[PDB]
Structure formats: structure tokens, C-alpha cells
């Protein structure tokens, strides 16, 4: 159920990323079927915004690098992510991962490929629980990250 916490973190982050640009999307399971999801969201959001300003300084906006189809999406996610983390995991890399994930969702809605949002969420969840969890647990878990953004 450490996996579930990672899933709900992903679900809330994407929900707000889309909510704030006028598309509604909700995949939380907390019920029906200051919570970790909410507080991690806020840090992820602040740390990802610092990222973006840095990024966009120097480079074109990431949405223009995607190319954007229901066929290409899996390859796109997998190629960038594996590239990002190939020689290691750290907090800023994890921050960029989530930021990257977010613009993919945002672009998917843009490109009238809304359902892709749901694929990206579950790709992000399983990448976390398969490849990022151990490192995060070893570095004080998510609680250590939120406290860096107090």
C-alpha cells in the first residue's frame, strides 16, 4: 500500500495540472471506491515550476518535442523517462519526471487525445513503484521531500 500512496500522489498531481487549465479529470480512489497526496502535490508543484522557468530559459517548450499520437505515446514516455534516470535517481530528477508527465497529459488534452491522460497516469504510477520507490524510501520517503518545500 506504499504503492497506493504513489498512485494517489500521481492522480492528484495530474488532476490539479489539468484542473488549472480547465479540463476536469479525476482518478483518486481515496473514497467511494492535509493528506499525503495533497501536501506532496504542493511541493511537486513548486519544485516543478522552478524547473520550468529554468528549462524554458534555454529551450523550446517541451510540448513541441512530443509528437503526440496514441501510437507514439508509450514510446515517448518510456524513452524520455529511461533517459532521465539512466545513471541515477535524485529528487530533482523525480521532480522533472512529474513535470514531464504533466505536459504529456496537458498535450494529450490539447491534441484531442484525452484518453491518453489515463495511460500516462498509470505509466507514471508503475514507473514510480517499480524504479523510484526504493530510492525515495532510502532518502526519507516523501516526507523528506515535502519538508524541503516548507
Amino acid at each position: 500500500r506504499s504503492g497506493y500512496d504513489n498512485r494517489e500522489i500521481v492522480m492528484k498531481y495530474i488532476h490539479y495540472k489539468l484542473s488549472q487549465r480547465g479540463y476536469e479529470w479525476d482518478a483518486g480512489d481515496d473514497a467511494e471506491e492535509g493528506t499525503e497526496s495533497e501536501v506532496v502535490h504542493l511541493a511537486l508543484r513548486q519544485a516543478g515550476d522552478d524547473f520550468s522557468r529554468r528549462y524554458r530559459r534555454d529551450f523550446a517548450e517541451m510540448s513541441s518535442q512530443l509528437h503526440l499520437t496514441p501510437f507514439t505515446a508509450r514510446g515517448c514516455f518510456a524513452t524520455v523517462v529511461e533517459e532521465l534516470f539512466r545513471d541515477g535517481v535524485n529528487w530533482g530528477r523525480i521532480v522533472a519526471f512529474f513535470e514531464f508527465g504533466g505536459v504529456m497529459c496537458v498535450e494529450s488534452v490539447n491534441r484531442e487525445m484525452s484518453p491518453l491522460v489515463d495511460n500516462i497516469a498509470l505509466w507514471m504510477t508503475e514507473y514510480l513503484n517499480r524504479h523510484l520507490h526504493t530510492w525515495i524510501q532510502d532518502n526519507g520517503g516523501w516526507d523528506a521531500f515535502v519538508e524541503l518545500y516548507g
Binding site: 524547473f51 524520455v80 529528487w91 521532480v95
Partner: peptide
């Protein structure tokens, strides 16, 4: 069948740009 090399290059390129912008602590 198929992703164009042209698009694959862009993802490679995107990944490296991302990595160059990472601060370790966040």
C-alpha cells in the same frame, strides 16, 4: 510501426535537455 527516427531523435534530445536542467535537491 512506426515511430520516425526524426521523432525518436526529438525524444532523445528532450531527455538530455531535461537532465541538464535538473537540480539534484529539487
Amino acid at each position: 510501426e512506426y515511430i520516425k527516427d526524426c521523432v525518436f531523435k526529438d525524444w532523445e534530445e528532450l531527455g538530455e535537455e531535461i537532465r541538464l536542467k535538473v537540480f539534484v535537491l529539487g
